[PDB]
Structures are given as C-alpha cells and as structure tokens.
From a paper:
V-ATPases localize to the plasma membrane, endosomes, and membrane vesicles and play an important role in proton homeostasis. The V1 domain consists of three catalytic AB heterodimers that form a heterohexamer with threefold rotational pseudosymmetry, three peripheral stalks each consisting of the subunits EG, one central rotor including subunits D and F, and the regulatory subunits C and H; the proton-translocation domain Vo consists of the proton transport subunit a, a ring of proteolipid subunits c9c”, rotary subunit d, and subunits e and Ac45. The structures show two unique mammalian V-ATPase components, Ac45 and (pro)renin receptor (PRR) in the Vo domain.
The 3D classification enabled us to distinguish two different states. In both states of our study, subunit H is well determined in the cryo-EM map. Structural comparison did not reveal notable conformational changes in subunit H with a root-mean-square deviation (RMSD) of 0.656 Å for 365 Cα atoms. The structures of the A3B3 hexamer in the two states showed that ATP hydrolysis triggers a conformational change in the subunit DF, which further induces a shift of subunit d. The c-ring is subsequently rotated and results in a continuous proton translocation across the membrane. The structural analysis shows that the TM1 of subunit c”, Ac45, and PRR do not change their relative positions in these two states. However, they have rotated ~120o with the c-ring, suggesting that the entire c-ring including subunits c, c”, Ac45, and PRR function as a rigid domain in proton translocation. We found that the switch of AB heterodimers provides the energy necessary to trigger a rotation of subunits DF resulting in the spinning of subunit d coupled with the entire c-ring region, and each state will rotate ~120°.
Numbering used by the authors:
A (entry chain n): 105 to 155
B (entry chain o), C (entry chain p), D (entry chain q): 5 to 155
E (entry chain c), F (entry chain g), G (entry chain k), H (entry chain l): 6 to 155
I (entry chain b): 2 to 204
J (entry chain r): 302 to 335
K (entry chain d): 4 to 60, 67 to 281, 288 to 351
L (entry chain s): 365 to 455
The structure:
Amino acid sequence: AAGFAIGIVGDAGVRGTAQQPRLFVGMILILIFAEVLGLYGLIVALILSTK
Amino acid sequence: KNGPEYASFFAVMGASAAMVFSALGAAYGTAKSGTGIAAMSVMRPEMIMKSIIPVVMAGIIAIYGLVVAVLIANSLNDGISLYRSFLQLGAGLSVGLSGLAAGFAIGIVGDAGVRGTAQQPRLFVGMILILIFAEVLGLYGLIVALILSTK
Amino acid sequence: KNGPEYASFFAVMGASAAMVFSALGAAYGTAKSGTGIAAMSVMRPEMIMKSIIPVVMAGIIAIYGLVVAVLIANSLNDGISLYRSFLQLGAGLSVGLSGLAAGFAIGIVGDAGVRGTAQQPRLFVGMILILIFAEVLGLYGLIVALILSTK
Amino acid sequence: KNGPEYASFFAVMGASAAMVFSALGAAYGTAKSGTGIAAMSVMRPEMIMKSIIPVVMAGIIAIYGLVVAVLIANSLNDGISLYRSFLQLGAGLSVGLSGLAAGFAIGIVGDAGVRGTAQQPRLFVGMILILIFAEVLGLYGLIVALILSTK
Amino acid sequence: NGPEYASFFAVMGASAAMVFSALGAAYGTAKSGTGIAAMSVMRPEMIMKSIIPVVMAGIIAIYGLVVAVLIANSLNDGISLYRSFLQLGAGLSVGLSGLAAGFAIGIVGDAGVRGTAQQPRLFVGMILILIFAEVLGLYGLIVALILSTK
Amino acid sequence: NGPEYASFFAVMGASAAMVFSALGAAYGTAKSGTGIAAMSVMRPEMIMKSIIPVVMAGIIAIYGLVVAVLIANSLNDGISLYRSFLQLGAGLSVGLSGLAAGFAIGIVGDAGVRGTAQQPRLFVGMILILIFAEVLGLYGLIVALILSTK
Amino acid sequence: NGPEYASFFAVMGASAAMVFSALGAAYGTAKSGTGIAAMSVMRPEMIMKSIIPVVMAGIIAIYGLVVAVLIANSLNDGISLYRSFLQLGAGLSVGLSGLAAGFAIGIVGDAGVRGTAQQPRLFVGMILILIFAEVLGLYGLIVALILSTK
Amino acid sequence: NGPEYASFFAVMGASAAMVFSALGAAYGTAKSGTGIAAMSVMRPEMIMKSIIPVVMAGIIAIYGLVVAVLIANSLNDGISLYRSFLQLGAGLSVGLSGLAAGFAIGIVGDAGVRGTAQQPRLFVGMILILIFAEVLGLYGLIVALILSTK
Amino acid sequence: TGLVLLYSGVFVAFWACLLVVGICYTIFDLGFRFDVAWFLTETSPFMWSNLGIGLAISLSVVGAAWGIYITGSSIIGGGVKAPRIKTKNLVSIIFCEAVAIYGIIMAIVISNMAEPFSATDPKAIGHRNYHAGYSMFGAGLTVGLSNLFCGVCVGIVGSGAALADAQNPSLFVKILIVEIFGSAIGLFGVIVAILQTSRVKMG
Amino acid sequence: FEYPVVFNLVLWIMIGLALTLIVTCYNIWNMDPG
Amino acid sequence: FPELYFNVDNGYLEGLVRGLKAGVLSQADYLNLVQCETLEDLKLHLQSTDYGNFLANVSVIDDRLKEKMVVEFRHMRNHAYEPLASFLDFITYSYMIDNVILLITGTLHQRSIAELVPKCHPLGSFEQMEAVNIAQTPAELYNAILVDTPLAAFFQDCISEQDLDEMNIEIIRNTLYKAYLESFYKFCTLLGGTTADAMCPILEFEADRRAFIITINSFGTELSKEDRAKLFPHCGRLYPEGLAQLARADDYEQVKNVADYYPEYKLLFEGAKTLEDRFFEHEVKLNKLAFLNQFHFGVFYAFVKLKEQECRNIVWIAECIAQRHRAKIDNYIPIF
Amino acid sequence: YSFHCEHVSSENEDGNLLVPDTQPSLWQMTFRDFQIQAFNVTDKKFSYASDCAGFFSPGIWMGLLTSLFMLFIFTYGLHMILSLKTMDRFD
C-alpha cells in the first residue's frame, strides 16, 4: 500500500515538477505521508515478532 | 479457563487487517488526491500548502488503524479464549475496512475538491467541510474497534 | 444454558458488518456527491452551504450504523447461545447492507441534483425531497435492527 | 419439541434478506429516477412536484419489505423448529427478490418516463399506469410472504 | 424399494427438461421477434408471413413440456435409483439441445428476415435452414423418451 | 452386479453425446446462416449452392444421435463400473470433438460465403476446407464406436 | 487386480487425446481458413497452394486419433493403477501440445496466407515456419507412445 | 515398495514438461511468425535471415522433450513417494520456465523483426537479446536434470 | 471488462479446486468420504421445500419486472413523437405482468402442501417425506426460472413492437401474435409445476 | 472435534479477506492520473 | 446476450431517434417539392411536414435547416450516460477536424479568432476549452494549446514542426481523417454484437470512398505515390491488396479495374449521375440498412448522415427553383 | 478401516453420537478419545482411520448453501447499483 501511493504521486509529481518547479517542495511533503504508512507497518510487525 | 491452540490466529488476523486495510485506505486517499495537487500546481501554484489537507486527513486514517493494532497486539498470549480472540478479529475488520471506506472517500473528494479550487478559491472553505464527514467515518470505525477490543 | 466456544463469532460479526457496510455506503454518498460539489463550484459558488445537504445526510447513514454497533457490543458476553448471537448478526446485516444501498442512492441524486441546481435553483426544493426518500431507506434498516438485537 | 440450536439462523436470515433486498431495489428506484428529475428540471422546471410520483412509488417498495420483516422478528423465539424457521426464510426471499425486481422496474421506467413527460405532457397518465403495473409486483411479494409467515 | 434420496435426481430431471427448453424458446422468440418488428417498418407485407421463426421456436417449448409430463407422472415416493438417473439425463438431453436449438433459431431467424426485407428470394432458403435448426430440438426429444421409458 | 450409482455415468455419456453435438451443430448453423443472408442480397443465384456448410453442420447432429441411441440401448440396471466409464468417454469424445467440428465449420463457412459472392473461384476451394472441418467430427465418431463396443 | 475406479482414468486418457487434439485441429483450420478468403479476392491462382496450412492442422487430428485407438485397445476390466495413469498422461501429452501446435499453425496460417497474397516469395518461407509449428504436435505424440508402451 | 497412487505425480512430471514447454514454443512461433509475414511485404530479402527466433523457440520444445523421456525411463510400477515428487518438481521447473522463455522469445522476436526491416544494423543486436531470452529455459534444464536424477 | 473478471476469476478458481479436490478423493481411497447420500438425506427436506416456494414467486417477478422496463422505456421513447402508443401498447405490459400471476398462483399452491412432522432421522424421515421435499424445490425451480425467461421474452418483443408502432399504426396488431408465443412459455411453466406437485404430500 | 468449525472460520475468512485485498489492489493498480 | 441490457441506459434515447426517423421526408414528400415554383411555395410545403414554422422569421434555407439538426443532435447528447456519450463524441470529430484546419489557416495568416464563431460548423464547435479562443500565436505555441481538445490523440501523426508550411493545408486534413477512421473502427470493435456488424460495414465503405476519391484526384497533382499511400485509411475491404494497386494507378481506368475485383464497388463505377452521386446512393443504402437492427448504437450515426442528406436535398430543390433551372431537379438522393 | 472420533459422549446437546432410546435416561457416558475396529484386524494393530470429523457437518452445509445462495442474489443486486453512471452535461 505504501509503494502504491509513492508510485502514483511520484508519477504525477515529477510531471508537474518539470512544468513548474514550485511543486518540488510540495511533492516531497506528500511523499513523506505516503512513506510512513510503511513505517506503521514496522511497529506492528516489530511489536508482534518479539512476543 | 484456557483456550484451544487455534484460537490466537483470529486475533492476529484482526491485527493485520486493522493495519493493511487502513493503509490501503491511506494509499488511495494520498494517491488520488496527490494527482490533483500536481494538476493544480501547473496553473495555481499558491494553494500548495493549503491544499495538502486531503493528504493529511488521509494520514489520520493510517493512525486510526495503527492504535488498534497496538491495542490488539498487546492483549495477546497463549491460551487466549475464543471469545476474546474473535473480538480482536471483529475489531480489526471494523476499523480497517471501514477505514478503507473513509480512505476511499477522502481521496475522491480530495482530488475533485482541489480541481475546482484552481477555478474557484471560494470552494476551499467548503471542501474541508466535505472532508470532515469523509474522515469521521474512520472515527466511528475506531471507537467500535476499541469497544470490541477493551472487552 | 451455556453456549459453545465458537458461538460468539456471529454477534461479533454482527457488530463488524453493521459498521463496515454502513461506512462504505456513507463513503460513497460523500464521494460521488463530493465531485458534484466540485463541478458546481466553478459556476455557481453561492450554493456551497446550501449544497452540503447530501454530504451531511450521507453521514447520518454512518451514525445509523454506529448506534447499532455499540448496542450489539453492549450485549456481548462469553458463552452466548447461537439464537442470541444470530439475532445480532441479522441485525447487523439489515442495517449495514441496507445502509449501503441508502448510501448509494444519496450519492447519485446528490451528484445529479447539485449540478442541475447550479443551472436552475428551482430544483433545490425538489432535490432535497428525493434525498429524504433516500435517507429514510436507511431509517428502515435501523428499526429492524433495533427490533432484532434488543429482543 | 425442541429443535437444533442453529435452527434460528434461517428465520433471522429471512428477516435480514427481507430488508436488504428490498432496500437495494428501492435505492435503485430513487437513484435511477432521481437522476432523470435532474435532467428534466433544467428545461421544464414546472413539473417537479408532479414527478416525485415514481420516487414515492419506489418508497412503497421499501415499506413492502419492512412490514414482513416486523412479522418475522415478532415471530422469532428460542428453540423454534426447523419447519417454523424455514417458512420465514422462504417468506424473506419471496418479498426480497420481488422488491429488488420491482425496484428496478420503477427505476428504469420512471427515468424514461419523466424524460418523456417533459417533452409531451400527454404521456403522464400513460407513464403512471406502467408504474402501477410495476409497483403491484411488489404487492405480490407480500401476499405470499404474509401467507407463509402466518402458516 | 429404492433409497429415500433417490427421487431427487428424478425431480431435477423433471425441472431441467422445462427450464432449459424455456430458455431456448426465450431467445428463439426474443432475438428473432426483434427482427420481425424490424422488418415490418420497411416492408409491412411479410409481417404475417415471417412469423414462422417465432412459431418454430414455440415447438421447442412444447418439446420440453411433454417430457416434463412424461417424467413427473412417472414419479412416485421412493422410486428405484436406476430409474431416477435415467430421468435426470432425459431432462438434460432435451433441455440443453432445446437450449441449443433456440440459439440456432434466433440467429438465423433474425438474419433471414433482414435479407427478406432487402430481397424476398431468400425466403425459400431461410425456411429450409429453420428445418435444420428444428431437428436439433427434435433429436433431443427422441433421446429423452428412449431414456425415461426404460 | 456393480454399484447402484454406476449407471449415472452411462446416462451422462448419453446426454453429453447429444447436447454437445447439438451445440456444435447449432453454431455451425448460426454462424454460417448469418453468412447466407449477406451473400444472397448481392448474388441471389448461389443460394441453394451455398447451403453446403449448413447441411455439413447437420451431419454433426446425426453423428451424436448415432452414439446417443447406441448408449440408451446398452443401458441396463446394475451395469458394472468398467462398462459405464466406457460410455462416458464415448459420449464425451463424439460430443466435444463434434463441438470442435461445429466451431470449425462456422468460421470458414461464413468466410467462404462472404468470398464466393465476390469470386466464383473460391467455391471449389471453400468445400475443401469444410471437409477438413467435417472429418474432425468423423474422427470423434470412429473412436466413440471403438470405445462403446468393449 | 486393480481397483474399480482405475478404468476411469484410462478412459479419460482416450478422450483427452481426442478432444484436445480436435480443438487444436479445429482452431488451426478455422483461423487459417479465414485468410484463404481474403487472399482469394485478389490472387485466386494460389488457392491450391494455400491448402498446405489446413492439412498440417489435419495432422494434429490424426495424431490424436493414433493415440486414441492405442489407449482404447489397451483397456480391460481390472487394469492396474500404474497402467491407467500411464495412459492418462499419454492422452494429455498428445492432446494439449497438439492444442498448442494447432494454435501456432492457425496464427502463422492467417499471417502467411495474407502475406503470400501480396508477395508470392513468402510461400517458401511460410511453409518453413509451419514445419516448426507442426512438429510440436509430433513431440507430444512420441512421448504419448513411450508412456503407453509400459 | 511404495504406495499404489505414487505414479500419478511422476506422470504429471512427464506430461506437464511436454505440455507447457510446447505451449511456450507454440506462442514463440506464432507471435514471431506474424512478425515474419508483416515485414515480408516491404523487405523480402530477410526471410532466411529472420527465422532465427523460430529456430530458437524450437529448442524450447526439445528442452521439454529430453526431460520427458528421462522421466519416463525412470518410471516403474510402485515407485517411492519421494522419488515421484522429484519428477513432478522437475517437470514443473522446465515446463513453466520454458513457458516463460516461450513468452520472452515471442515478444522481442515479434518487435525485433519489425525493426530489422527498416534498419539492418539491429540484426547483430536482436539475436544478442535472444540469447538472454533463451538461456532462461536452459537454467530450467540444469534444475530439472539435477532433480529427476535424485 | 473489470467486474466480469471477478466472476470469471472465481468460477475458474473454484472449479480448479473442485477438480483437484476431485482427483484427490479417488486417488487415495477416500471416495467413501464423499457421500452424496449424506448430503441429500441428513440436511433437511425443508430447506429444499421452503426455498422452492420462495423461488416460485420471486424468480417469476424478476422476469416480470424485467419485462416491464425493457418495453416501458420503449413506450415513452416512441411516445414523445407518437403519443397514440400509450393506449394500444399497454397489453405488452399486461403480458409481461400476467407472468407474475403465474408465480403467485403457483406459490400459494406449493405452500398449501407443506406440513411439519416430528422425525429427525433419515430412516424415520421416510421416502414419502424426502420426495415431498425435493419436489417443492423442483416445481418451484421450473415455475420461477421459466417465468424469468418468458418474462424477458415478451419484454424484448414488446420493446420492438413499441418502436414499430411509432412508424406505422396498422403494424402493432400484427406483431402482437409474437408476444402470445412468448407468453405461452409461462403457461408451459405452471402445467409442469402443478404436475410435479400433484402426487405430493408431507407428513 | 471442531474440524468443521475450523473450516467454518478459516477458509471463508481467508478468502473473504483474500478478495478485499485483490479487488482493492486492482483498484489502485490502474488509477486515473490522466 | 448483449440485448437484454442496453435499455437500462439507452432505452428512451433509442425510441427518440426512431421517432426522429419518421420526420425524414419520404418519396411522396419529395415529389410535391419538385412541383414548387418559388421559395415562398417552398416554405408552404415544408410547413406540412415535421419541419413546420421554422421559416417564420435562398441561402437562409441553408442555415435554418442545418441549425435544426444541430439542436436535435445536441439534445440527444445531453441524455446519453457513458456507453454512448463517447460514441456521439466520435461523430463530432469529423466536424472538429474540418473546423481546426479552418482555424490553423487564419492562425498562419494572422487572422484572429473573431472569424471563428460565424464561419464554423456548430456540430463540432469550440464553446468549451477556452484556451483556443485566446491563442493568436503562429501555429507552434498554439499546438501546445491544441492538445487541450479531444483531437489530441489524432495529432500523434502530426509533428508540430511539420505543420509550418511543409505540409499542404489539404493533406493534413486527410491524414487526420486517416487517424480518425482507424480509432473509430477500433472503438466500434471494442463494442461488440449488433453495433459491430451494422456499423463497421458503413465504416468500410466510408474508408473506401477515401480510397477512391483520393487517387482519382491525385493525378495532375504533384504529390507522389507514397503520399497518397499513407493518406489511404487502412480500414476497409481494400486493405492488404487494393491499397497497393491504387498507389501505382496513374490513370482513370487503372482505378476502375482494381474496383472490378469487388462486385460491390463495380456496378458503382457505371456512373460514366456521376461517381459521387453513385457513391452517395450506396452510402444512404447502408445507413438505411442500419435502421433495421434495433439494439445497437449505429442508429445514431446513421441518423446524422441521413439528416445531412435532408438538408442537402431541400437546398438542391431550392437552387433549381430560385435559379429557375429545374431540368436537373430530379438529381437528388431519395433516401426514404 | 477403523473408526475414530473425539467426542462419543452421551447427553445429546447438538450432535453427540450416542443417543438413548428414552429421553430422560438414567445412564450417560463419555469417550474423550475413541478408536474401534472390527472385521478386518491385522497384525494386532489398527488400520487407517475413518474419522467422524469432516470438513462439513450438516449444520454448516445448509447454512453455507443458503448464505452462498443469497450472496449471489446480492451480487446481482450489487452489480446493477454499481453501474448507474450519471450524465455529464445538463440542458
């Protein structure tokens, strides 16, 4: 689910970045929210494996 | 007193489904609204920090599935009863697949809501009102997952 | 008098399916009508507080499913009978899936209504009447769930 | 005298299917015809109250499934025999799939009706006569389910 | 006599003789009768003549009717299992071939009447093909009667 | 004798012999019969000469009927299990290969009559490829007979 | 001796050697038979030259017929389980690879015949690709034999 | 020895190695055979030069042939269950990987011969790509040979 | 197609399980575990009987409501330019509504013959009682599904007759005979349905 | 003794959940960025 | 199987366009308009038909007729949901292509967007996508504006730098129409059943008119045989063989004998009524045949190509009346 | 083969194997494991087992076939509601 969100907004983000570079600071900011979904995947997996 | 050997499978499967199905909701909420930000930023590059409110209200849906995963995984032990174990499975579906619904609804109104904002900035005060009723669906699914897992 | 070990599964699934399927209807009523607000906003931005009547009445379908979710979860005990747990399962399906249908009907007429309301504002006294007929469909699923789960 | 403990599953499932399948059809009649109200009202806005006749005829389909769902839920009891519980499951499918059927019939005819009534007012008495023959099919779902549940 | 569950396969053979023949008579009349109202607007002369594909498809319906009468009267409470399996395949043999005859009729019955509206020389050839579609319904009947009456 | 449910396979061998050969003969009638009407409008001369594929679809129908009435004559209460499987493979092989021959006739039978209206040279070449689409059904028959005698 | 259900698998080897080979033979004849029509409307001289794709699809049919009479003649009441499973894999090998080989013939048959219509130099090249397409059916046959010997 | 049912997995190793490898070699011939007939209209010089993907896909068929006879020669009545699983795992490893190599040869064999007509400098590079698309089946050999011998 | 891939992705998968589940029951010895006798006997004779009463009326009216909306869109479609169709062509609605009568007449009949008992053993539940169970299922199946097919039959012809009458007034009384043979299949449904429930009695 | 009851709640649950993965994973795989 | 649906969505609109078919002037309607002698008497007989009271307020007969078939076509597109609304958009692309070549000419010669509203076909119009209204840039910064229009996918054979006078004005219409006919055939092949055998025979002959009328006017022109090869649509019956022999033609009889391989297109080369008057009567023979089939989308495209024949025929009656030359007045197309 | 079950108890509750003839019986019993063989014993050891367990019991095998029946009714009803697009333009 994390790579699905990074793949979509990473696609349309680098299209608009070449057409306007003001998007580049905003494109990363959505990409962080797309990536920490996998970071919530860790703290359920790590909290389950050590039991 | 004690439960059978196959009992802890359902409580574990409630823990994963609370995290998977909320993340697929948090995926569609971020991805579908993310293209509308890239479509807005070609013509109206000013509303680029104001317009990330769909992608941050889609982020709450992931944290909705996160806390019930830690709620379920901290109650786990061998010999958990089948009455206790089904409650975690009923918890995780009621927060994940309901958060998947709130994840689907946020990304749809987030995408279209920032398309019309490039042609009408008065919509921005009204679009956030729509996103509240989209995001409150995850809040309802959260509190039923807590009232099922606290038992 | 005591029930078997697996008998609590259905009333758990009753509280789950009452919240999942009603949210997916409440998601679609927000999502399909939320694109209708976006196309309306670029032409007639005076009807924005007027046009959020479909998106609030979609949210009633979720709180229809919410109040039966906690009502089923209040009656959960260990070792319930099959007859007592099936009664909450059929109560859950009759409010979630009927709420899913009533969530579908609000989202379509919400999309079609507010787009025609921009081109002609005379529709708003008629559009809001079809949504009431669509909302009361959700209310029909409520009073069958209450007459099932409480007894 | 006492039957199996899982015997009450079917009459409960007959009670839910009387309300799920009736609400799915009645949501189609309000959405498919309610979309046609929006396309009609832009050109001919006078006959807006005149055209909630197919919408209110779809509303009778919803209470067609509600009454039988009340009669089954009042007839539920712990330890009902397999003859008694299955009589209400056959009662539920008789009213449910009929209301799901006649929900489609009012939907498509009421959609095509109010699109044609706006361009010729003579078709109104003709449109309302077809909707009588469509809505009476839901009445055939009652008096077999009312016979089955009373038996 | 036979076992208690033995009558189930005879009952399912009795219904399947009727429903699958009804499906063939459905598409045989609906797909072709669409072409009949299609033909009548540009040439209203052959409207009473070209209703032969919708009446041959009606014979598909009575093909499944007689074997349903043959089987359901031969039923009894607790028949032998060998007699009931024959009535199951008796229903399927006339049913699915009557289902097959309906797809044969409705395609060539629609195709023939469109050429009839363009050139009526086809009408002698079109009715000949509908005979060859009708033996498909006829072949299912004679296998059903030779199976159920054993 | 054998088991009670042994005769169920030989009944299904009788049904699948007919309903698959009927489904093959239907498509060979339908897909070619659509091509008859498209040819007859422009070239109405070759209309009884063009019905060579539709009768060659009809021979697939009688190919199943030979096997079907052969099995119904051999059916009897208490047949052994080895006898009943042989009639199941008989009806399956003459059925589905007849369905293959019915599919192969309809595609090139339609393509032949669409071309013979445009050129009379293909009418000798059309009947060549239809024979190769017919011997597939004949190959199913000769293995159905060798499987039902034993 | 062997079990009662063992003869079912060997019969299934006899049918699947036929109907799977027949489906490839039907598809190869039909897909390449459509290209004969489009070729003939401009180059009617290469009509008899263009029968070589559809006869090589006919080799796939008799490849199935050869194996089918081998499995049917080795059938007997009370064959061993090792005997029957050899015959089931013998039927799947000639049939399904023949289904593949019949698929490869019809694609290059449709492409090559349309290709040799515009330019007759392809005829020595089209027959070369068809040989490699045909021989896949032979590779199924030679492993169908050596499984059926034991 | 082992159980009576053990031969079925070793048969399925023998058959699926010959089905799936010939299923891929058929697609590699058919998809590239379309590419041969497409370039032959403009560029008739490269017909003998361009049948390299067809003969490279022909090795995929004989890749499944060599492992089939090697498995069938190891077939005895009542082999051990450990030995029969090794032949099923070997047959799946060569057939489906050959089905993968049949796919990869077919795509670039189609697209590459579209480009070698317009620019003949691709001819060194196009076959250079096909070596990597052919050795995938060759890796399927040395795992199937090491598994069937154990 | 997106949603068709779901049904065609499950039907291939479910048949692929039931194929390999099928060659693993025979291949060990476990065909005794299959027991189609235990499936038809131990369940109930009421699950078949009460479903047949439900499928009798519900599957008839899902053809009757199917028959209405196909020609009802064609009534009002042609009725815009030619408003005279609304009086003559309502009999096409009636023939696709009289099919629903054939269900409700049958559904009362099948429910009139269902009666309870006390037995719970498939030897105590005699063959007079199990045969009464499946016969309501079979007669309810053939009056429901055949009325579905004749319901869509007269509706499709009814839509064509509504379009043909828009161009010419004299045509509709000639094409009406096609709807009789379509609605005759509904008559052919109920004759089988009473005949399958003639000799039937529960108890 | 609870073998059906396991095949009650393990098979149809894993497939229930298997779908709502795949039908969801399909719905995000080909979206419309246009 | 694809016929018990399609009345869920397109039930009402199908009966609508069948009702508008009855408003087409028949053969007996055509005979009374020949008997007219002035334009005022032409106004009187048209009031007896369905057109009536449209001239209450000879070149005004051209505009007031064709404005009626625009609003009738626009009313049909307002109610088609999703299986048909793209299909009606494909009928407008033939009018958008003739509009955009009219627009790149004034763009090249610096004639601004003021001439756009009165001098374009209202069927394929530009009243949305407002970027095209502002653009005065000489045909290179306007192609970047042009791609915000549904003709974008047809410009994938149109290089932007090839537009600047290296291609002739007429050539770019035909290679856009070549890109248009391949897509509309493939879109009508994606839809299956009754709309795939009643529509694609119309598109085959329409591509074969663009096979013959191109090469019969490409004789004295200085466009080579490879130019007229790629201006042929690769769509119809002539695709693998007839397109090859049409390139090497160079003569009127050399396009006739390649039409003699097909018995449909021969007996139409016996105009020796001219050729395009013989191609028109076969075209309305195919559009009339599309009205036979019922549950299909081809009834709409057959209506528009016949409604343009209605506006064509009445003007030809009026031009023989106003110019008083009614010895060739019988050379119209009697479609019904 | 040899039978084997896990609960062969008396005291009929839903589906226990032993049933007395008269319903208020004085005798009751329970076998929390079980395996019995007759008529084909070899080598003083049991043969292959025939369990009483089963993938399906006749409670779950009617409830499935009715739940799978009206899931299919739902997925016809859900298919139609999932397929009503609206129009794009309004006049």
